[PDB]
Symmetry: D2
Subunit: 260 residues, 4 copies
């Protein structure tokens, strides 16, 4: 009004990991756009470029700056972020919403996990944050905010989660280490731990429907969450409201983290 203490209006954020309209990264987009932020979107699959194009109705007026980045490729993220920088100039944060593991590994007994599948999960689900934070920083000379999305399975052993649990525990340590390293550069680093939400990747998690229902009967709030509730915490964490907050993990999960 200005209740720009948010300060996020006419600042630019990069949102990585929109697949389709149920993507967590999409509820983030929706909430930042509404608050006046300029947005740059990166994707891996050509199908996700098409959904982005159709999705950007909504309020951003170019492009909304659609770049192709596979986090497995050092080259693609170095050169993707260099190009963002040349095309829109400097950046104020990044929302990271990228994970992957093989369906077979997740199914599927943990002690049987292959080396390639263990390491693939760490590659895409954890390390990607680290090169991404490194390349993005370059476009952030007076600081900024990076936010990654995690699951309670990085903190506790959860039934069908297997190798992804381990990849999230690793993501979560990566966040604190990036926070200590990038803090003197006025960069904040944080995670949202989201409750379960029906998305494209979610149907690769076994017993997914049973866990929805557990939150419903068991979480403090006796409901589950949606993408725009994550988006609203992303907005806090990306804004100046979270000024004093780094290395932290915010559960947007109806309070399930706090119970039994």
């Amino acid at each position: 009004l200005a209740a720009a203490m948010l300060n996020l209006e006419n600042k630019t954020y990069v949102i990585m990991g929109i697949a389709n309209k149920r993507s967590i990264a999409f509820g983030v987009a929706k909430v930042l756009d509404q608050l006046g932020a300029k947005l740059v979107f990166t994707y891996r699959k050509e199908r996700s470029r098409k959904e982005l194009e159709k999705l950007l109705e909504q309020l951003n007026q170019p492009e909304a700056h659609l770049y192709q980045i596979d986090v497995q490729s050092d080259e693609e993220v170095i050169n993707g972020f260099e190009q963002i920088g040349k095309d829109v100039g400097n950046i104020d944060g990044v929302y990271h919403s990228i994970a992957f593991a093989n369906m077979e590994d997740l199914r599927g007994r943990f002690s049987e996990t292959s080396r390639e599948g263990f390491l693939l999960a760490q590659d895409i689900s954890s390390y990607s944050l680290t090169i991404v934070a490194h390349e993005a920083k370059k476009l952030m000379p007076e600081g900024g905010s990076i936010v990654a999305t995690t699951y309670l399975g990085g903190e506790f052993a959860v039934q069908n989660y297997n190798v992804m649990g381990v990849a999230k525990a690793s993501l979560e340590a990566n966040v604190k280490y990036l926070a200590l390293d990038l803090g003197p550069d006025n960069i904040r680093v944080n995670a949202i731990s989201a409750g379960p939400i029906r998305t494209l990747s979610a149907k690769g998690v076994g017993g997914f429907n049973t866990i929805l229902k557990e939150i419903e009967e068991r979480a403090p709030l006796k409901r589950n969450v949606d993408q725009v509730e994550v988006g609203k915490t992303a907005a806090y964490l990306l804004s100046d409201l979270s000024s004093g907050v780094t290395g932290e993990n915010i559960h947007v999960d109806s309070g399930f983290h706090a119970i039994k």
Copy 2:
């Protein structure tokens, strides 16, 4: 982010009170505020301190959280005077000087229980009474410290009272989440306040944050009030039982 909401802020002593940073932040965001204080002789710092933008009173009620009557009658009166409410900010704690000074194993039964009473149980009754004024739901926030999670040098009995308060929060959040009332804590980094004088070696704890916290700077009262505004508002829709550390990232290191 907006006006139209009424929040009760408990625990302003003066201009450096954490609950004053909260006040300021909520006032700028357009909230109507209600203020509690402990003793009738300091009603007058307080009205004087409250310029600021609130237009009456701003609704000042005397509540010593040790009395069951005073919390009940107090909130009763608040609902009568201003109607019903959106949230509460809790920023009260106390322990005896001689307890915190003071080897922990030497603590007395009554000084132990006094810290528990004032720093912990008060969130319980206040949440019960405040709920009566929150028929669509709302948000309750309490202020805690790192010494509730970890044994910290001269914190002693308050350390145990804060871990009490932190478990207090989680349980209230379970009990009250069906009523649509969310309950969260903010673990604040060290801030120079009137009550800070009771914490031994305070210079050394601030210098430690500068040298060691990710941010390499101490936090302020308004920084707390900003995370409080997130917590109190709809911004934090799915969050309850949580403890947001507003402390330059110190909770996360070594």
Copy 3:
């Protein structure tokens, strides 16, 4: 058969909180008794004095030394421990297995808890470690080890547990503060976080039967724990085998803590 790594065998341990033979503290006594230790027992109630005398076979010779101590009274625990010292000389540790809350409270909606109810639970389940630790330390000139008994309800908001949940978060912080304080005195202080066991006190917990069957179905080891399992970890903590362990909380719970 030296251990003698354990270093338990001609040593005196005060055991507080035996009601009958299914008391978690009785699991402790049978295990230290087996390991060669001298034992001192404290009771509150009369009913436990007759319970204790009969129960005290086993292979402990005198009384073995039974003191009435009600942890609500400063005098009882100062004089109690002062008597233990006159009668047996100095001591090597304390097993603390004492807690109480009004059943009306745990019943029970947490926000409705009375102030007397809440402070009662704190006094007995939490403050009691602090004077006991203080009074016993006067019999441990050379150092020593003190263990209290906790529950997952101290870390997570659990359905029928309420004010006791809050009293166990407090106890656990009490163990950490006492470790920091008493460490330079070479007194280690630690907690065991026990899973559910059918004891006389377990009556006070609504739906105990249900939290029994959940451990068995969900806990890594797919089974419940018994009192001698807690006992063995208590031997471990009381012994020199845990020589470098202080302020710690060990979960004897089949792995329940580590999941979901």
Copy 4:
């Protein structure tokens, strides 16, 4: 109690001051038969001399580089064939490139990150798989971690992320393998002067901090870790699994 008739595979001995050597000493004294594994020829030759000690052969020294599926599978089959089936594994293996640990976390190379995970974290997963084949009635697996897996500690970097991963590996393994009556647990050891420790920047300051700030006001040694390991490896820790015990003078529990 606390005895013989048990057989433990101990992995990660380099020299007289390897943490796992402290574990070996403690177990050796408690009557166990010890099988040892090593990567470098250098370490085998340190093992042979260290074996004086009580163990009467070999003790059963096996070359196993946890980087090859093939060597951990073939090594454990051979351990099977040579000493029969087993009662537990003590795992003390970790690696990171020195450049990394120096060395600003945000600059970490992809390949340095995945190397830390491969050797420091995944190794427990396959070790557990192959070990389990020699433990038809159950047993106990212990891995060695460090507070830096829980908190961003100064020069620790890529190794802290690999221990965070390790620490989760233990919990998920515990859940998977607990029906099979196998317990899995970690010991979070305080800082101790070992071959690999001198790869950690400012170790010497991270030593003296424990002595001034830890409840106990001293650091620990390899044998204190071996006494906890002895607890975890034996039935004395019967109901305990997916747990992390800090043998660190209480450091984990303060400020």
